[PDB]
Scaffold this active site. Sequence first.
Site, mmCIF file in Angstrom:
data_model
loop_
_atom_site.group_PDB
_atom_site.id
_atom_site.type_symbol
_atom_site.label_atom_id
_atom_site.label_comp_id
_atom_site.label_asym_id
_atom_site.label_seq_id
_atom_site.Cartn_x
_atom_site.Cartn_y
_atom_site.Cartn_z
ATOM 1 N N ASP A 48 69.249 -13.002 9.699
ATOM 2 C CA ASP A 48 68.213 -12.620 8.753
ATOM 3 C C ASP A 48 67.624 -13.855 8.086
ATOM 4 O O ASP A 48 68.336 -14.627 7.442
ATOM 5 C CB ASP A 48 68.788 -11.675 7.701
ATOM 6 C CG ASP A 48 69.500 -10.492 8.313
ATOM 7 O OD1 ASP A 48 69.784 -10.536 9.528
ATOM 8 O OD2 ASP A 48 69.778 -9.520 7.582
ATOM 9 N N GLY B 119 62.411 -0.394 10.703
ATOM 10 C CA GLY B 119 62.408 0.891 11.367
ATOM 11 C C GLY B 119 62.676 0.730 12.850
ATOM 12 O O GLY B 119 63.154 -0.306 13.301
ATOM 13 N N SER C 197 61.171 -7.317 9.233
ATOM 14 C CA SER C 197 61.185 -7.611 10.672
ATOM 15 C C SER C 197 60.320 -6.594 11.410
ATOM 16 O O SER C 197 59.778 -6.945 12.470
ATOM 17 C CB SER C 197 62.637 -7.695 11.148
ATOM 18 O OG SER C 197 63.289 -6.441 11.040
ATOM 19 N N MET C 198 60.014 -5.433 10.838
ATOM 20 C CA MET C 198 59.114 -4.520 11.529
ATOM 21 C C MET C 198 57.823 -4.368 10.756
ATOM 22 O O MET C 198 56.737 -4.506 11.327
ATOM 23 C CB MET C 198 59.777 -3.165 11.753
ATOM 24 C CG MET C 198 59.324 -2.517 13.038
ATOM 25 S SD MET C 198 59.542 -3.646 14.421
ATOM 26 C CE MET C 198 58.096 -3.268 15.399
ATOM 27 N N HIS D 7 64.461 -10.755 11.943
ATOM 28 C CA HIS D 7 65.771 -10.776 12.573
ATOM 29 C C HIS D 7 65.664 -10.163 13.959
ATOM 30 O O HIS D 7 64.701 -9.454 14.264
ATOM 31 C CB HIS D 7 66.809 -10.021 11.734
ATOM 32 C CG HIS D 7 66.479 -8.578 11.516
ATOM 33 N ND1 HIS D 7 66.470 -7.653 12.537
ATOM 34 C CD2 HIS D 7 66.143 -7.903 10.393
ATOM 35 C CE1 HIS D 7 66.145 -6.469 12.051
ATOM 36 N NE2 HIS D 7 65.940 -6.593 10.752
#
Lengths: 177, 192, 192, 192, 192, 192, 192, 192
Positions: free
Chosen positions: H171, H68, H97-98, H122
Amino acid sequence: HPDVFNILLQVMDNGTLTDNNGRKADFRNVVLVMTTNAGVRETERKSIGLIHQDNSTDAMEEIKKIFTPEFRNRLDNIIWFDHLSTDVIHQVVDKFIVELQVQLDQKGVSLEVSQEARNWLAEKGYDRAMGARPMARVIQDNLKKPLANELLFGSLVDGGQVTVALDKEKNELTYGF
Amino acid sequence: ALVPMVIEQTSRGERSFDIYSRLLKERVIFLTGQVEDHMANLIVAQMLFLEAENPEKDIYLYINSPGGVITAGMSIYDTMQFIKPDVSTICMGQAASMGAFLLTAGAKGKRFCLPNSRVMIHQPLGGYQGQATDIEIHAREILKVKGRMNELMALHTGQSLEQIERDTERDRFLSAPEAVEYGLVDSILTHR
Amino acid sequence: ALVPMVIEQTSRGERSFDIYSRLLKERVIFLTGQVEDHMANLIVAQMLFLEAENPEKDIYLYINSPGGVITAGMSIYDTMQFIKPDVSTICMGQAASMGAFLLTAGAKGKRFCLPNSRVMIHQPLGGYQGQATDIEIHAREILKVKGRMNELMALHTGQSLEQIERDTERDRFLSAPEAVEYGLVDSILTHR
Amino acid sequence: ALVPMVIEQTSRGERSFDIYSRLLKERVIFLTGQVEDHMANLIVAQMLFLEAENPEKDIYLYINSPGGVITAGMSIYDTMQFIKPDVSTICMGQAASMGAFLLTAGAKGKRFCLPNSRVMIHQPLGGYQGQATDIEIHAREILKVKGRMNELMALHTGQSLEQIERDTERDRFLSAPEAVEYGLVDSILTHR
Amino acid sequence: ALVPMVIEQTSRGERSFDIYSRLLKERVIFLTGQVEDHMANLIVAQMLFLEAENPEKDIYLYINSPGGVITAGMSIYDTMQFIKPDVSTICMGQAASMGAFLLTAGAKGKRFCLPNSRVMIHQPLGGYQGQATDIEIHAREILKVKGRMNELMALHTGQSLEQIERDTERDRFLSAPEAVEYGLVDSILTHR
Amino acid sequence: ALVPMVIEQTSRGERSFDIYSRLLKERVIFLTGQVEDHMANLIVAQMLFLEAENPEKDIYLYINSPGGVITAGMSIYDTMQFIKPDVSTICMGQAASMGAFLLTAGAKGKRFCLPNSRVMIHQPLGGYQGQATDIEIHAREILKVKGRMNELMALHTGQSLEQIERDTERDRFLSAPEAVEYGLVDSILTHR
Amino acid sequence: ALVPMVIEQTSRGERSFDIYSRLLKERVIFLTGQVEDHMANLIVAQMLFLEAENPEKDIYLYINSPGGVITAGMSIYDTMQFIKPDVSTICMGQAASMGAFLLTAGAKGKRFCLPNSRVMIHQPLGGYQGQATDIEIHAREILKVKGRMNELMALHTGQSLEQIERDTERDRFLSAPEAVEYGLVDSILTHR
Amino acid sequence: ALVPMVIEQTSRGERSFDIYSRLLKERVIFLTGQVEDHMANLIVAQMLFLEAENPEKDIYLYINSPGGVITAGMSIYDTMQFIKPDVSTICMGQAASMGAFLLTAGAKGKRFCLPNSRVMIHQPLGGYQGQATDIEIHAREILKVKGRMNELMALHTGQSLEQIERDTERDRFLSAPEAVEYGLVDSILTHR
């Protein structure tokens, strides 16, 4: 109603209560006891989630917010009761059996009960959700009914002795003269 | 409105839930439609609540799904494997490799499927667009995911890993008796 | 709002349900519109709740459907065949091979259709796009599904399997008397 | 919100329904807008509930409809003809061959129309695209449906079948007096 | 939410309606926006409920409408003319030939319009696409509808039929004093 | 949900309204967003209810509007001028010739605007497509509307009609001090 | 539903608000998402209610906004500056020149920002299409608005007007320490 | 409706919350789907309420998110780091990643992930269109944001800053054991 607690406030704090005629009741030599099950359901279940929380600080400690702290502030102590252990259950069954023996000796019919019969009666009516309450009904239904038949029909009159033992083969009791 | 309400009496005789909540009260969870993040999250919440309510009583998961995201399905699967009570999966309608994965993921001996259900299994789908390095990374990741899914299916169904690998190369359609014989489910519910 | 509310008195005289919930309380289930996954899941939940409520009292399924997905319909059919109480299907309006399948799938002797209803039966539809091998796989699957549906219809209507196979090659429209004579329904509801 | 709420007192003086539910409580059912599957299903549910509530008291169906699907209308018609209490149809606004069919389908002597209402009747519409054989099948079906509708209208209005067949070849617009004289309705509501 | 709630005290001092229901309780009905089938049906239901509640007390219809379907408007008009209590129409904002028709359709002597309202009258619009015969049929029908509307307006306003026919050939905009002098309304509400 | 609920205690200490209803209870009406038929109708209903509740206490109309339809605004304006209690308009944010018209339309001496508000005035917009005669009719109507609006603004602000006519030829942006000096508002709210 | 409900006990132990209403009860107002007319109106209503409830207790405005309309933001700003209690603005997430303007507009000494928040300031955007005269008018207006915003920011942050004018020519991104040193906020919230 | 209701008994035995509110009552917060402003604001409100309710008891954040906006995630992260009670993050499904940043941002020793979860990390994404100067400004800002995120991750996971910088260039997919060994989570939840 929560408003009787408002009378109980002065009853516990100053030990005096006034009726509509202005006469005061003296509570200084009176023991004030109040029974309840407030925090029981609040702690009877475990936490919801992958990680179990303590859920132990709510040990009926959350009886607060229900009792208007100026009311809990004048209580001597909040005595929590724990569930009866299996040994306590055995002792309660023995107590009931002694009571039954007294009631039977009142009619001159001495009762003899085997220890295995006692343990079967205990494991039968054993419950933690209801404590020793269903034990009375269990013992009644298991012992008092055939004995009542014998005493009322006349086959067992003053002077008889009764024995009982466990039928381990079919999970039943023994009955005789 | 679109969903009905029901009435049941315990103490006061006044209980109106949507029929889905009434069935959830009986430890019955419905997994219908596509499998995505929010639906899987709702299923996980229901299973957690049912486990915390009574860790000894089974949970019944009714599966009718054309598949979905592998990730959300793995969340439901991990929550099924983690909780204490046995979760029994009943396949009504269809189960397309993700409904099917979760169906075979039920408690052993308690995975049932209705006689006219249809079960399909296949290797996972995916894709990526970008530079060659990112393409390689995502391809290695999807291959690892496929291998993990094949391992889990070979564990849950009893078939050898090579057999699962050869069978899930393409869409494999299995009826109720073929699914029972294959090892996906344990028996077929026929009548009361 | 768009759906009305009703009032009925048992103990306190205070019961407001949407009219659909009120009719469900009388063991009346409505199957209207297209047949898909969520509608079929709702019907299955209603039938399960009604069966658990009183396994001895019948369930009335009012069918008005232009058809739908074969899979969702098979889920409703399996739930109808599984539960204990007899489910009686009443065809009002139309039943296009899936409403029709579920109509013939009712309890024998209790499948009624209104005098002006229209019933259609046909072989299932489908399709697939892809490589020749996947085309062959999906074609074999849809042929197996068609065969299974023909077997089930020949079982429920009493007609021979070859007769059903020859009749459902194209759309066969049957009015109420033709449906009664054919074996889809048992009688026609005319008046009180 | 968009729909108003009303207050009525029987015992406690606390009853808030949407105005449509309040009118339904007085055995008044509204048929407005296009006729489709879900609207017809709601009307059928309302009529069934009203019949089960009091089989001796009439039901008032207020018709304002530009027509709709023949099938859904036939469902409403069959439910009107089946239930015990007399259903009286009042045409306010318009009735375009399906509102009109259901208007003429009311209980004889109790079909009213307001003085400025407009009634239209016409042969049913339809169509199909496909092979010549399926075209022939669907054409025969729509012709049978048209014949059945003409028979039912000639029965309910008293006109001869040939007269109805010649009149419904094209759109026939009838005002309130022309509808009364034609036989669609029995009288015109003018004042209290 | 978007609509406010109000509080009024009669017996217990606990009454929360949306402000529209509160005003309906005072026999005030709002006719706003375009006139279509569902809005007109709601207005008709409100007027029927208010008439059944107290047939002797007036009903106030606040009109702010850019027009709408002639049919739905005729339904509202017939319900206004049928019920017993006098319905008084107040034109706030605008009234474009259908709001205007219903405004002139109020009880004589009780049709008011605010000093800055705008009233427009015009012949009805319509159209049809198809064969020449159906074109002729629909054209004759729309001409009959226009004639009926002109007759009703000439009746309600007191102007001669030829005067209305010449005036409504095009859009005729009338302010509050011109509407009062023309005969559409009886007086102008200025202050308390 | 999106709108908050509040708690206030009068007798039982149990009052939960949406915050808009709570502020309406204090005779505070919000006019926000575009001005159209339904929003203006809601504002008119609120003002009527507040006037009937207490004809002696002021009504506070908070204006934040980019304009809107002239007709709906004239309805709000007529309702403001008609009712007995003084309505005080507070301009927060902006007021684009319709918010601005209603702002200048407040009770004299009670029209306030916040120090950073923006006020714009301009001649009304419109248009029409059709024959030359209808174009002429609608152009004369929009010119009459523009003249009426200029007259009303010259009345409410104290400026001469020619000054308003020259100023509203194009968009005239006025800050709070320029609006106070111009005569649109009476003073600026700064602090408690 | 999507929003959770909470339980708090004061007298009866029965209080269920949406979590946003529960936090509003603690004088906590959330400003999230884009700034437009309706959101700003809701924020203004909340601030007015909180001020009328207890004019001595602070109001906490949690800002997470990518900006929005200058007008609606100026309404919130004027309401913040007008009311009596000190409003403390906490910037969580971001504040893009309008969230940022309202953040610097908090009570001096009570403007906090979380350590990982991002603050951006820039000159206002806008535009207009039309004749050259209207273009000039709208350009002068937007220049006046930009000047007013620069004046207000130079007042609230303590920086000189020329410094603000040179800094807001383009997007200026400020982290939490840079925002503290710049003067937008007073300190950074780190821990309890 | 779509969300179920549950029943729990404390004093009166009458408590019906949506299942999400019931789990929130047990200090369980769900972070599912994309991370945006409103979802993050809701999570922050839930965490603030749980912290104010009992600052000593942990908060369980169930993470299933494809990532996000960096800003909204940083708001959740700052609120997690600010409040007093330890927040334990459980990764079910995925964390891109979030979700992954917030997962590693949990209380040390209490960050768990289910055995079949997938974690990806990432560098942040972004972009801008405009003049070269604004491009440079936004590029410097996104580089500063990337550096700050790398610093925070190197702090929370224990890996060196250069290692995180080299790993998050593309990634990086990590399963549960690889995530445990890497330092993102502390252990894997397997069974009760």
